[PDB]
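Supplementary Methods S3. Input chains for the assembly prediction are listed below.
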Amino acid sequence: SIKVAINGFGRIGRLALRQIEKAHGIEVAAVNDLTPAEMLLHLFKYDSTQGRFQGTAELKDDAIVVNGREIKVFANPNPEELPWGELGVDVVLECTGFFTNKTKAEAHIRAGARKVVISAPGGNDVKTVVYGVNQDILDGSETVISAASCTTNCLAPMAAVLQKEFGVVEGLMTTIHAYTGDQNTLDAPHRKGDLRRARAAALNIVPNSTGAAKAIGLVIPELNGKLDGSAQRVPVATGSLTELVSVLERPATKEEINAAMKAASSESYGYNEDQIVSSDVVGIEYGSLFDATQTRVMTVGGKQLVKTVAWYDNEMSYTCQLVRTLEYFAGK
Amino acid sequence: SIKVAINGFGRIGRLALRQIEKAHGIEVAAVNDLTPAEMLLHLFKYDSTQGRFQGTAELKDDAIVVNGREIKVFANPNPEELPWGELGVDVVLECTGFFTNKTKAEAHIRAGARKVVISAPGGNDVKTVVYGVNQDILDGSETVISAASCTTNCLAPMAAVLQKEFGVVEGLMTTIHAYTGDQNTLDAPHRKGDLRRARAAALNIVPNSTGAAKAIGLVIPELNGKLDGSAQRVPVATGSLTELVSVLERPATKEEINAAMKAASSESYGYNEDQIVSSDVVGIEYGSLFDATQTRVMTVGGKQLVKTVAWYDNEMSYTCQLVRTLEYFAGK
Amino acid sequence: SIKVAINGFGRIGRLALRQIEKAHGIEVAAVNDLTPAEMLLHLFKYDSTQGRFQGTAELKDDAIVVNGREIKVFANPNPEELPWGELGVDVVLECTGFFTNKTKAEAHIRAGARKVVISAPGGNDVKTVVYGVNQDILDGSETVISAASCTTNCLAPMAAVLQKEFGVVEGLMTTIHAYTGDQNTLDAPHRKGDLRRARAAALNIVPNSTGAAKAIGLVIPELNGKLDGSAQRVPVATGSLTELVSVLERPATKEEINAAMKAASSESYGYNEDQIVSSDVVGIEYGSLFDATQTRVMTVGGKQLVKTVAWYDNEMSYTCQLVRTLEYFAGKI
Amino acid sequence: SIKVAINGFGRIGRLALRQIEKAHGIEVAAVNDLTPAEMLLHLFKYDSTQGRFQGTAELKDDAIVVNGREIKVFANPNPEELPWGELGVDVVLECTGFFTNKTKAEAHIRAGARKVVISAPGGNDVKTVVYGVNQDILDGSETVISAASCTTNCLAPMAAVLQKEFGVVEGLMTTIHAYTGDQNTLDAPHRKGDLRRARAAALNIVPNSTGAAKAIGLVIPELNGKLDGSAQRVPVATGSLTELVSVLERPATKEEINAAMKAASSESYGYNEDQIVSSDVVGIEYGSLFDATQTRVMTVGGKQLVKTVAWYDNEMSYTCQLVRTLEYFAGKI
Ligand SMILES: NC(=O)c1ccc[n+]([C@@H]2O[C@H](COP(=O)([O-])OP(=O)(O)OC[C@H]3O[C@@H](n4cnc5c(N)ncnc54)[C@H](O)[C@@H]3O)[C@@H](O)[C@H]2O)c1
Ligand SMILES: NC(=O)c1ccc[n+]([C@@H]2O[C@H](COP(=O)([O-])OP(=O)(O)OC[C@H]3O[C@@H](n4cnc5c(N)ncnc54)[C@H](O)[C@@H]3O)[C@@H](O)[C@H]2O)c1
Ligand SMILES: NC(=O)c1ccc[n+]([C@@H]2O[C@H](COP(=O)([O-])OP(=O)(O)OC[C@H]3O[C@@H](n4cnc5c(N)ncnc54)[C@H](O)[C@@H]3O)[C@@H](O)[C@H]2O)c1
Ligand SMILES: NC(=O)c1ccc[n+]([C@@H]2O[C@H](COP(=O)([O-])OP(=O)(O)OC[C@H]3O[C@@H](n4cnc5c(N)ncnc54)[C@H](O)[C@@H]3O)[C@@H](O)[C@H]2O)c1
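Predicted structure tokens for the full assembly:
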């Protein structure tokens, strides 16, 4: 089995272990964070939005035993000092949020791993993959890659269909996004100087910037420079949606758009016709779930403006995309 | 001394009484609801989002005493039976949500009131007023008028400035809206058959339809048929924003758009440049609060798509617009 | 199979259908509510706190198809007129909240059903059962019984162990309880005149009365008149805990109380030693989950005051208790 | 002209400045935190639970101007490098949460400040004052004192009335408490190793320990060893209540208790008879607000168990008590 280490046992890291535990041929040999093993085990077993872990998890000296198999636990904030070489670690899932570019992420390779997947945008100099859209750009010679953002994994399959079947002149994106741990619990100073993320997460609609639309060219080259957008964090603990308002190169109807999305559906890109809300998306394994009920095509004097909306669980949808990308990568 | 009756002592009705108490030339002679006076007084004094009433409020038999002055209390679900003639009520604020067209609202005229203002869209059979945009369409001979919806009062001043300064080809609106009482507390059947308002209000992003953009022609005739949009209810108990993505007739910059909004700012239309969030808008008295920090102009190959955003407290912003429209109307 | 009808396809009614679907020998033949079948199907499939239904659910004409089996759907607010006799309904789960005494619940018997279980306190004149505590009082000749409240199913197994092993002089209960559908979404008039349930559910700590402790005598007769208590509704959509502060008849230690609770553990009464919070209880199938980490026995000059705490998902814990009582009841007749 | 410096411009620090701006004879000369002045001004002006600041607030060169008066701003995480001596700081309000004992708080003294008031429990070797209960223990010669915790300021006036009017044998406290910043936004590792504060603050009922009842002896010596309790954090951003279940030394009625609380009510200890909920308490200036509607006296064979409940805005109630203690203390230095 390919051996994986998870650096950062947070929301994405812990769910990544859940998904990898359900996979065969790949196993997690070690996890690293800033806390003792008892804290990590408790958070792995009990989850406020994703439910209890469906499996066995017990504590040992400096390890957790998951489904009968031992996983080493480390608490070292500097990746260069981790024993990845000693443990034969092939791929590191970098999920701390503090090593989100190539030079920082390479500390893992100096620690003895062969490859690193960043669970976030990683810059314009590393390949960036949304599984189901462009995973084929990988050939295994890359040392550091990126699985993009949760929002990019939601937007990209929707935008890819619009570009291929109708063509895109331009588009503005709005993601209505669950609050995350980078927002404060209550009004307090923020480490990055962000005056809006400084505010109480569960009390506010919080405008915030996102690069998912601007950087879309890394996933869909033909859309480079055609999209921008922003985000609104709102008080749901997980579950999000992405709206895209676009000008297309050809006329379209709501029925034509919806039919194209369904034709492109896959394990990564679901198609929905029910009148769902965000909680219905919690825990889904699609990276993106197009919502045909929200498609709108407005025609005013022959000029068309199109709205398309797709849901995503920013935690579990992205985690499943990250693990799919990891598995595809690990075979090269 | 124009005498007012409030039919429906809910969120809008109770806040309207707060505002009318601070107003000159208008006084509330009576309120009506489905509940005893003790319940109405308690809800007037204590408010979970708008704070405690800053004034005196005591109970008398079949009456409440507000700031030393008597207001009669009735509990009659049949408006046709209310004693508006014997009390001499000049204007009724119809705020129950159950009498939102001319034929139903005229029950107050048969009951002896002289005028009715509906605190919601009232159908195309009724003049619809956003104060600060089109109040001049009132000549005073109208019997029943409408103050539009909260979203309309937010959108109209923003769209009016864009139309005046640049011209609008078309636009799609997305309002990220506080949950309201027409949503269920927990998943349960919904009276109107709405599968999304059936869901727990405080747990979900809930897509829902709205006519604010569709009906904008009633307030700004030159924009008739050029705007559409929809809503997303999110878990804040009050406070909302409206995004408009539009194609304009002339080139624009972020600085030009913001300067025009600031020049037009007023008591009905505020202008903001701080990094605010939704809780900062709770209790504001603007009908709409333009947010210059969210203005975006995207240009791709000479083609432009424009994003503008305005905040509004769907409760208090609309209530102040309703009272402004009431005062203007009563002067004719 | 025993054929069951659910009157009131609400939180308890819909989750009861999920649990009965997993049970053998008992089947839900019909559900009734105030709404069209498409609305009921959608709410059965999608649930904001309990997750998507793990099964198949499709629509037919005045029926829903669940796991390949048809369930007729009705929309009649008056239970007298439901076709329970025509459908051979043995037991009706009365979950509307509007027929919570014996004479009202008997509308289902006049409609052709043989038996009724009320999913709430049903008054002092009907047998009231917490499964795992007093289900043995059912001999099958009863027509209308009650499965008590969610809080009673949480309190009763905990209080029973205290009574048997230490004896209870008196106790005051405080249940910290998730908000429910009887609270308004925002500040608004309340149908029952309750000034505190009138307030926005997800914004407030809301004091409210509860009869679970006062009525405990119906489940544990030896505790009749020895308990009272109250509730605090808080902004979690489901998941609750019950604290009991009691004076015992004999000295106790934290370890002795915890050992007694674990010894009494079962499928209805779980035992927990982890540092859990309310979200960890969402969806559990225990009727009550004792939390050994919160036990406190205080001694001041030989005088002892004891705190014991149990968790419960007021929706799913109670629903499973309701179905367990339904299954035991249907076995007797 | 008492000059105050606020170390830690958090929830308590920012509200403390709001209240001191309304106080005569005392003024804030400087504030210190870990962040640039622009962030601090923004958080002072805009507040998600306490509303916008009712006053003027603008930015200047490494300072904020509040109501026309400039307040220097510092960003030094080491307290004993601060220029308190150069600025003439008389009293430092220590509100960081990182210097909550005499040894750490004395960094402000070595930095040239005369006095320090810790906005939290400060250890058994620092005088602890709940204003309105025991401020008379201060004689002005102390260098480091404590204003206790928010829960202590809520419990103490209530327990003092019960002790004076009836006498207390023992009592167990349960505080239903707003979530605070020491809880994580979402499930994540927690710096102090607390498995329950590690969990999502706004999604959970979270059991947690508190020392308010055990340490009550520092404020009311006659109750030393007589009280204990714990806390339950719930998803309200501010606003809390404290329940006390106590055994009293003489018989009592709810009417007697409520009358005694009402007679003792003051600016520090309010009395309420309306059916309020937690949002009604946000921003109040009482340190504790007794709720007579929740008083319960249970009698079982002559044995009595008493429940009394008091509200408090854990932020603003405590801040007002802190400023009251500061004014009394400063009048003696
Ligand atoms: N949460 C989402 O919806 C989401 C979606 C897609 C991507 N991401 C990305 O995943 C990453 C993690 O986000 P998250 O939401 O899981 O955040 P989180 O804070 O829940 O997880 C971060 C974890 O890393 C640990 N950590 C921090 N510094 C460390 C260090 N030097 N060494 C070891 N461990 C360290 C922390 O203790 C924490 O457990 C970020 O890059 C984020 O942008 C998050
Ligand atoms: N809340 C908002 O954000 C908002 C904004 C703009 C407009 N509105 C509109 O204002 C109206 C009221 O909405 P709300 O949010 O105040 O709703 P609400 O439910 O808070 O208030 C409605 C009130 O009317 C009473 N009522 C119902 N039927 C009645 C009858 N037959 N006779 C007398 N009283 C009766 C109810 O008891 C309740 O107090 C609706 O038309 C709504 O669309 C609401
Ligand atoms: N939810 C809990 O935590 C909980 C726990 C234990 C017991 N209960 C009890 O269960 C019962 C239902 O509570 P719930 O939480 O499911 O409430 P709910 O409002 O979710 O469900 C009630 C359902 O009954 C329907 N209904 C109402 N009147 C009707 C009528 N005349 N005919 C047919 N259908 C009708 C409603 O449409 C609704 O779907 C109540 O007695 C409640 O006290 C609830
Ligand atoms: N919030 C309440 O309900 C409450 C009530 C009573 C007492 N308290 C106590 O008050 C204190 C502050 O709590 P809070 O709720 O305001 O927390 P907070 O985190 O909101 O405030 C702490 C502030 O101190 C700053 N800070 C941290 N370390 C610092 C350092 N070394 N130097 C300078 N500034 C530093 C932080 O940036 C932050 O602005 C704690 O001791 C807490 O227990 C809180």
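The first helix of chain B runs from residue 11 to 21. The pocket of nicotinamide-adenine-dinucleotide (ligand 4) is lined by residues A 188-189; D 7-13, 32-34, 77, 95-98, 100, 119-120, 149-150, 180-181, 314-315, 318 (CB under 6 Å).
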